[PDB]
Design a protein around this ligand. Structure first.
Ligand code: NI
Length: 361
């Protein structure tokens, strides 16, 4: 099948992103202050830890934005906070003609928003619908929601900005893996889970325009609302490791794809790289052995279900079922095909686990 995956960073490009983030750290933390472990609580004038503020400044700087806020609830929390700062309950939100991310749909339902739908793959239709229906804001997913999605993030954002429609991007599984996240190419705010970036459980980030971020910070009254200094430092730690380790993974996925396409595993009928929704391999077998292969692969070290995904815990490759939306659209595929996210493994390991599992069914 045909896909249009996001463009991965090379190892050289990834190093440059790593270095640029560390440069921002240096410019916001005197060295002795970086070794302070992270402060706690509702410090006067900030209503958050001093170190958390600093980390937020670093995040804003690193992603070419005015401001940032760390929030509870990871990626879902970030999207909720961002949407709540862009529109009111009962207002109109523009979304792409494809399945809305499940917890995002929950947020939409809990806010009583009216959805306006258009195919983002058709910029002409996008522009017409925006002019006619006058949405109060737009949400754009960075990763691919369905195989046929081929739109360029920056171009969709540019269209929205020209029409004066505030835009939020859901950048999960794209951050530190592509050249520009939403707030770097036209969005009013980007959002992402830090848990999916080798960071701490429960922590999400909203990064973008100060007026939006300030509205978010104003709602974070309570002690529990805050991200503690140590958690904030862990976000930076994870983010510094993210680009290079993912560039290594992107290389593994490309080499694995080439080997499979070259016939390394005769029992494989087809293989493709796809954003599903993170960039992974989709491997289809000639015979309906997918479930058996998944069972055998787990015994040989493959992760059988995700955590983050792409969290600090997820080191061995993930061999997993197909996504819900894809299975709905293609009811027979689940018997024949699987997703593989190599995580920190190499292609020879994935190939070996694949071959040994097939031999053992
Ligand atoms: Ni089959």
């Amino acid at each position: 099948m045909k896909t249009f995956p996001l463009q991965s960073l090379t190892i050289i490009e990834a190093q440059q992103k790593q270095f640029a983030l560390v440069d921002s750290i240096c410019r916001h933390f005197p060295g002795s202050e970086f070794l302070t472990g992270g402060d706690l609580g509702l410090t006067p004038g900030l209503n958050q830890p001093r170190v958390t503020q600093r980390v937020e400044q670093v995040l804003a700087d690193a992603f070419h934005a005015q401001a940032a806020a760390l929030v509870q609830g990871a990626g879902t929390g970030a999207i909720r906070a961002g949407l709540a700062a862009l529109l009111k309950p009962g207002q109109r939100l523009l979304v792409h003609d494809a399945p809305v991310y499940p917890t995002t749909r929950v947020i939409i339902e809990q806010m009583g928003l009216t959805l306006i739908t258009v195919d983002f793959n058709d910029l002409s239709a996008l522009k017409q619908v925006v002019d006619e229906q006058q949405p109060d804001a737009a949400l754009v997913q960075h990763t691919r929601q369905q195989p046929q999605d081929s739109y360029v993030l920056a171009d969709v954002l540019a269209t929205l900005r020209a029409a004066g429609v505030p835009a939020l991007t859901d950048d999960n599984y794209a951050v530190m893996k592509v050249a520009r996240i939403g707030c770097e190419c036209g969005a009013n705010v980007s959002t992402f889970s830090c848990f999916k970036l080798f960071g701490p459980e429960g922590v999400g980030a909203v990064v973008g325009d100060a007026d939006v971020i300030n509205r978010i910070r104003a709602t974070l009254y309570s002690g529990g609302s805050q991200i503690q200094g140590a958690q904030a430092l862990e976000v930076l730690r994870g983010l510094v490791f993210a680009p290079v380790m993912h560039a290594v993974q992107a290389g593994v996925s490309e080499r694995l794809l080439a080997l499979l396409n070259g016939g390394a595993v005769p029992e494989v009928k087809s293989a493709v790289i796809a954003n599903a929704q993170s960039k992974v391999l989709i491997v289809e077998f000639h015979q309906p052995i997918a479930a058996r292969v998944l069972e055998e692969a787990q015994k040989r070290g493959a992760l059988p279900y995700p955590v983050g995904a792409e969290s600090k815990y997820e080191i061995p490759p993930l061999f997993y079922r197909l996504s819900g939306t894809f299975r709905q659209a293609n009811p027979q595929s689940e018997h024949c095909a699987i997703r593989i996210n190599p995580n920190r493994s190499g292609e020879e390991t994935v190939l070996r686990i694949l071959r040994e599992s097939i031999a053992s069914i």
